[PDB]
């Protein structure tokens, strides 16, 4: 699916973004933090579907929002997977080393369907019962600190919903940087300006990116850079405040030296 070399590079963008929020984020963040953050995005994702039997019956799933929620879970999962790697063996939580069947019960839709290879996520994800069981499962995987499994699920989820996971990751990665530049930590960012959520600008930024461009070993940097520029442009961001992919790769090599 997505190549190991590209996955490495995504981890480096993630690391740089986390460093932008806190310079020694591995030292200050816990495994529980990333699990919580996945839990919170999983319910954001579920609220995209007409799951409520007492409100707004026959609403359509907001699949466009589901794309971004997936990518949000991705961010936090890459982060947890690399917090895990950086945790000393004697600080590894027992729930992540117990057998999987022993730390979760798997939810299953009532109706027949296909799933990912682990059988944790169910397709089509256009179906709300499939999504419910999928993300109730993802929350449990997050509780058992199974970040690498979650990453695999997301990737299978994006295959099924038929969008470019990596392209959207790059777009939202860029937006996350922008929020950090524009007062997200203090009370001052306007996330919904004129009634439009910042996330909803991202879709137009990934229209000309192919699945090939974004995963190709000789094409990807360039492809990522043109997505990043689109998002910075879409938010009228100064050139001096933009970073490109190599700036991220460079911050990554340098700043794994404590």
Ligand X SMILES: O=c1ccn([C@H]2C[C@H](O)[C@@H](COP(=O)(O)NP(=O)(O)O)O2)c(=O)[nH]1
Interface residues toward ligand X, by CB under 6 A: 17-18, 21, 41, 44, 52, 54-55, 72, 75-76, 79, 172, 176, 199
Does 230 appear as a known binding residue?
Answer: no
By the rule CB under 8 A, 103 interacts with its own copies: yes
Do the annotations mark residue 12 as ligand-binding? Answer: no
184 annotated to a ligand binding site: yes
**For residue 48, with 0-12 CB atoms within 10 Å meaning exposed, 13-18 middle and 19 or more buried, which class applies?**
buried
Of 258, 247, 257, 240, the C-alpha closest to 12 is: 247
**Residue carrying structure tokens 């794994």:** 256
Helix (H, G, I), strand (E, B) or coil at 21: helix
Smallest gap from residue 232 Cβ to ligand X (A): 16
Among 11, 26, 32, 148, binds its own copies (CB under 8 A): 32
Q: Is 183 left (phi over 0), alpha (psi -120 to 50) or beta?
A: left
Least distance (Å) from ligand X to the CB of residue 44?
6
User: Annotation-wise, does 255 bind a ligand?
Assistant: no
Contacts of 140 (CB under 8 A, 6+ apart): 103, 104, 105
Nearer to its own copies, 9 or 79 (CB): 79
Would you tell me which residues interact with Mg ion (CB under 5 A)? 41, 44, 69, 72
Token digits of residue 243: 């970073």
Give the contact letters, 35-64, x = binds to its own copies (CB under 8 A), - = no: -x--xx--x--xx---x-xxxxx-x-----
Contact partners, residue 220, CB within 8 Å, separation at least 6 = 6, 9, 213, 214
Binding site, annotated residues for Mg(2+): 41, 44, 69, 72
Question: Would you list which residues are annotated within the binding site for dUMP?
Answer: 14, 18, 52-54, 72, 172, 176, 179, 184, 191
């Amino acid at each position: 699916n997505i190549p190991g070399a590209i996955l490495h590079s995504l981890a480096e963008l993630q690391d740089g973004l986390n460093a932008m929020i806190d310079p020694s984020w591995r030292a200050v963040r816990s495994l529980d933090n990333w699990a919580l953050a996945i839990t919170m995005e999983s319910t954001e994702l579920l609220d995209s579907y007409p799951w409520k039997w007492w409100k707004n019956l026959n609403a359509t799933p907001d699949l466009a929002n589901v794309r971004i929620e997936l990518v949000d879970i991705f961010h936090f999962s890459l982060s947890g997977a690399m917090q895990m790697r950086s945790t000393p063996d004697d600080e590894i939580p027992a729930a992540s080393l117990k057998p999987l069947k022993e730390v979760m019960t798997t939810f299953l839709p009532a109706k027949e369907c296909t799933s990912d290879p682990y059988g944790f996520v169910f397709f089509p994800l256009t179906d709300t019962q499939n999504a419910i069981a999928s993300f109730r499962n993802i929350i449990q995987l997050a509780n058992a600190y199974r970040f690498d499994v979650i990453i695999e699920c997301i990737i299978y989820a994006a295959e099924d919903l038929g969008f470019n996971l990596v392209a959207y990751y790059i777009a939202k990665h860029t937006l996350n940087c922008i929020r950090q530049l524009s007062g997200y930590k203090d009370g001052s960012y306007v996330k919904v300006n004129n009634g439009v959520e910042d996330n909803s600008l991202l879709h137009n930024c990934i229209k000309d990116v192919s699945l090939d461009e974004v995963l190709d070993a000789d094409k990807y940097v360039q492809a990522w850079n043109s997505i990043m520029a689109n998002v910075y442009e879409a938010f009228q961001i100064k050139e001096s405040d933009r970073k490109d992919a190599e700036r991220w790769f460079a911050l990554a090599k340098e700043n794994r030296l404590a």
